[PDB]
Design a protein around this ligand. Structure first.
Ligand SMILES: COc1cc2c(cc1OC)[C@@H](C)N(S(N)(=O)=O)CC2
Ligand SMILES: COc1cc2c(cc1OC)[C@H](C)N(S(N)(=O)=O)CC2
Ligand SMILES: [Zn+2]
Length: 258
């Protein structure tokens, strides 16, 4: 019926319902590290998550979303390429069926096992639905995951997944601190792009950290036990929920580091 990640409804089909799929600023993209240019005009990046208030985790049939109370100026992203203040609304991941794929952005064509997206909206537009209608409406902080050592700050997420196995299920998810998902370094690449799922709106300033976080094989295996289907339907494992790299077109990727 609707869009997803399969042969018959996956990324290569999305353009029929969402023609912007073939637009001028689509995401993700390949980050060619040799062509990205250091930009001295970039101000320092500010990730201020100390007062973040998580609420709930939801399996939406595409990924799982950890949702935050964004009714107050709490968890915010500022600086870097951004003008003004962007408020955290949710995070989610994209991942693969195997450790050699899963990320949406690639780095010199390298695919990581997964990619975390911390989604923020520009407070100048008042709320998320108005923000996605603007070219500078969203800022998505993207963080690569590689398989190696466990990420202790991820385990609370992993352990709730059994309770939201299928599409439409949610669970209370309070007091989760997203600071535990960040790598040491805030070095990043940035470029103007889009949502990577329908409606594919061209409203995102992408900020993709250079340093991946490490998660354990067991952690990512638990992601792959989720289901795309609803309860009581035949099992379709939630794997390979990533859009591949799209044409860069008339864009430059800027680096925050020399
Ligand atoms: C049977 O019903 C289907 C409905 C749709 C699709 C596939 C289906 O079966 C394969 C995909 C191709 N489009 S979309 N949004 O362009 O990916 C959504 C509508
Ligand atoms: C349905 O809930 C959401 C899903 C998605 C996003 C935000 C959501 O709630 C705010 C953002 C925009 N991503 S992405 N991959 O960072 O571009 C697409 C998927
Ligand atoms: Zn995403």
């Amino acid at each position: 019926h609707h869009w997803g990640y399969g042969k018959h409804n996956g990324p290569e089909h999305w353009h029929k319902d969402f023609p912007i799929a073939k637009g001028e600023r689509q995401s993700p993209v390949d980050i060619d590290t040799h062509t990205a240019k250091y930009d001295p005009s970039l101000k320092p990046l500010s990730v201020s998550y100390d007062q973040a208030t998580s609420l709930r985790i939801l399996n939406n049939g595409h990924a799982f979303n950890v949702e935050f109370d964004d009714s107050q100026d709490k968890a915010v992203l500022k600086g870097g390429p951004l003008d003004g203040t962007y408020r955290l609304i949710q995070f989610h991941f994209h991942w693969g069926s195997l450790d050699g794929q899963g990320s949406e952005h690639t780095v010199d064509k390298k695919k990581y096992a997964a990619e975390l997206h911390l989604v923020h909206w520009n407070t100048k537009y008042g709320d998320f639905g108005k923000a996605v209608q603007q070219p500078d409406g969203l800022a998505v902080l993207g963080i690569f995951l590689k398989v190696g050592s466990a990420k202790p700050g991820l385990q609370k997420v992993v352990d709730v997944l059994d309770s939201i196995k299928t599409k439409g299920k949610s669970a209370d998810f309070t007091n989760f601190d997203p600071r535990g998902l960040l790598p040491e370094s805030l070095d990043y690449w940035t470029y103007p792009g889009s949502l990577t799922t329908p409606p594919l709106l061209e409203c995102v300033t992408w900020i993709v950290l250079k340093e991946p976080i490490s998660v354990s094989s067991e952690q990512v295996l638990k992601f792959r036990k989720l289901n795309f289907n609803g309860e009581g339907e035949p099992e379709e494992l939630m794997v390979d929920n990533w859009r591949p790299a799209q044409p860069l077109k008339n864009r430059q990727i800027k680096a925050s580091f020399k």
